[PDB]
Amino acid sequence: PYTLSVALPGSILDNAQSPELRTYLAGQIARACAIFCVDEIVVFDEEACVQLARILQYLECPQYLRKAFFPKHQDLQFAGLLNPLDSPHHMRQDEESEFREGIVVDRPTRPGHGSFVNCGMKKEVKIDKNLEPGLRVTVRLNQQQHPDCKTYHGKVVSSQDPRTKAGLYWGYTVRLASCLSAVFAEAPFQDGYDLTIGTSERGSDVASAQLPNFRHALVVFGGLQGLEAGADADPNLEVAEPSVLFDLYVNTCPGQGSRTIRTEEAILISLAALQPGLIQAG
Amino acid sequence: PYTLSVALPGSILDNAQSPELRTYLAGQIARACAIFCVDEIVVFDEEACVQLARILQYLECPQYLRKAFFPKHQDLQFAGLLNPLDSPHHMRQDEESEFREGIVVDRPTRPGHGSFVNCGMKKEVKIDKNLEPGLRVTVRLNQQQHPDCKTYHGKVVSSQDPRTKAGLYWGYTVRLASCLSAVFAEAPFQDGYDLTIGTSERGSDVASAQLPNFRHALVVFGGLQGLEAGADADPNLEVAEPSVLFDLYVNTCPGQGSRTIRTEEAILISLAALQPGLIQAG
Ligand SMILES: C[S@@+](CC[C@H](N)C(=O)[O-])C[C@H]1O[C@@H](n2cnc3c(N)ncnc32)[C@H](O)[C@@H]1O
Ligand SMILES: C[S@@+](CC[C@H](N)C(=O)[O-])C[C@H]1O[C@@H](n2cnc3c(N)ncnc32)[C@H](O)[C@@H]1O
């Protein structure tokens, strides 16, 4: 199955009128990406990124694991006033699920015995492998999980498994990039992004665009000054206009009735505008 | 040229965590509609509507006219923390424009002479017709506007003119509907909405949908409980499911990775998902 990654600059957070709205905006990004089953979000420095990245990670992390993975931070002061992702890997105890994220507990194992994992279930989940504690893992529960002395049983599996195997969106990862050229180069896939797509009012009409067969797509968004800012700023990138950095450069809202479309708005519009092209090619 | 109207319930404002966010959410709606060149927004009562309607009107009104048309209200306490529409009819003095909205001043006219209008220009604009003051009008400036004794000159024209004639998006109007059946029936066009479109995760796939040639489109959105709530609530509408109220009932985001898409999010997604179908048929 193909991947989709989204890049945008942290600087959009500097545009907010309030601390509260700065947080809400971060949430808007998370949900936009969750909605379109994004696998990866890349926060890049166009000239804050740390705050945006942190918030995105907090929201993606299932709830029963936030306490463990995120100590009190001034950068999640407004956790509260968030929109939740309501994504398949966020459930309550109650819900039976095939798979469930977990943290490798830090309790006494016994010579030979796999670790304990906290999957937010009524009891801890016992597994096969002995593992380094505080590791986030993806556990697939057994079956024949008898009313066993205060332990469920299961096996750890690839975090790719709930997509490839059961068609379940299962969260995104978050990557920090120090510039726009680091967006492309510090990619997590062997052969980079088979397909790159940039966005702008002065790009080509998205209705013309013909998506090439692809394996890993990246869609890039600018902040307030467009992608021009992050192109110029980066020393490793000497272009007249940013169109040439990407396979495609699209305008996703023809005949827009506002002089501007904000980044968080543009992401929803662009990803829908593209969603059918994406599905066809991957 | 075809029209596009959007309907949604005021109740989405009751979902906000803050007074501030209640206002911001209202703004999100305005911009979504501005972006897609919406002509009409219909706020309906699914079981607040007044507050949402007011905010939408405040944002659409050009700035130089807000003071005149909107006294201090507790329902625009957070005007400040808004996103602006940046639409063609919002400019500063500075900008030369062919057309410009105005209010008919309330100054001494002379037997025979047209009114004075305030179009936010350096001088008042003198016109042809004698008109009832406090009327919002659409003025088209002349040419041969000589350095005349502290008055510009121009003619009042249809508010439809800057679209039909110069391809300029020029704002939306706002209508209150007391229920869902009032959305369709209290429509401002002789022959209603030639095409109706409702939205839901349990609608048909938007990629299949084949838009009929049309003159006036309405796209309807539910609040938190979907359109089911406003269907049931209204006494004049006895249906098992809301699909049948509309010509088309679409899911605009196939394979969504969040269990829910909020109304303000769904509007951006749906309107993009449809925008190309719309353009083809009108
Ligand atoms: C506030 S806009 C940037 C405006 C800036 N003045 C410029 O010249 O692009 C923020 C980002 O949203 C996206 N965007 C805005 N309008 C768009 C459009 N019509 N089509 C596609 N993407 C758009 C782009 O990624 C853009 O960099
Ligand atoms: C929070 S959702 C409503 C959820 C509600 N539980 C239901 O059963 O619809 C608010 C509105 O956004 C729109 N919406 C949400 N998901 C959608 C989807 N997948 N496709 C199209 N419109 C959608 C619909 O107008 C919906 O009534």
Numbering used by the authors:
A (entry chain A), B (entry chain A): 72 to 118, 138 to 372
Can you provide the manuscript's text about this entry?
SPOUT1, also known as CENP-32 or C9ORF114, contains a putative SpoU-TrmD (SPOUT) RNA methyltransferase (MTase) domain. SPOUT1/CENP-32 localized to mitotic spindles and kinetochores, and its depletion by siRNA resulted in unusual centrosome detachment from the mitotic spindle poles, delayed anaphase onset, and chromosome segregation errors. Structural analysis confirmed that SPOUT1/CENP-32 is a SPOUT MTase with a trefoil knot fold consisting of parallel six stranded β-sheets sandwiched between two layers of α-helices that promote dimerization of the protein. Our SPOUT1/CENP-32 structures also reveal that SPOUT1/CENP-32 dimerizes via a helical segment in the catalytic domain that packs almost perpendicularly against an equivalent segment from its dimeric counterpart.
SPOUT MTases use S-adenosyl-L-methionine (SAM) as the methyl group donor for the methyltransferase reaction. To determine whether SPOUT1/CENP-32 can also bind the cofactor, SAM, and to gain further structural insights into the substrate binding site, we soaked the SPOUT1/CENP-32 crystals in a cryo-protectant solution containing a molar excess of SAM prior to freezing the crystals for X-ray data collection. These crystals diffracted X-rays beyond 2.62 Å. The SAM-bound structure of SPOUT1/CENP-32 was determined using molecular replacement. The difference electron density map calculated for the refined model showed a well-defined electron density for the bound SAM. The mode of SAM binding is similar to that of SAH, with a methyl group pointing out of the deep cofactor binding pocket. The binding of SAH and SAM is similar. E Close-up of the electrostatic surface potential of SPOUT1/CENP-32 71-376 bound to SAM showing the deep pocket formed by the trefoil knot.
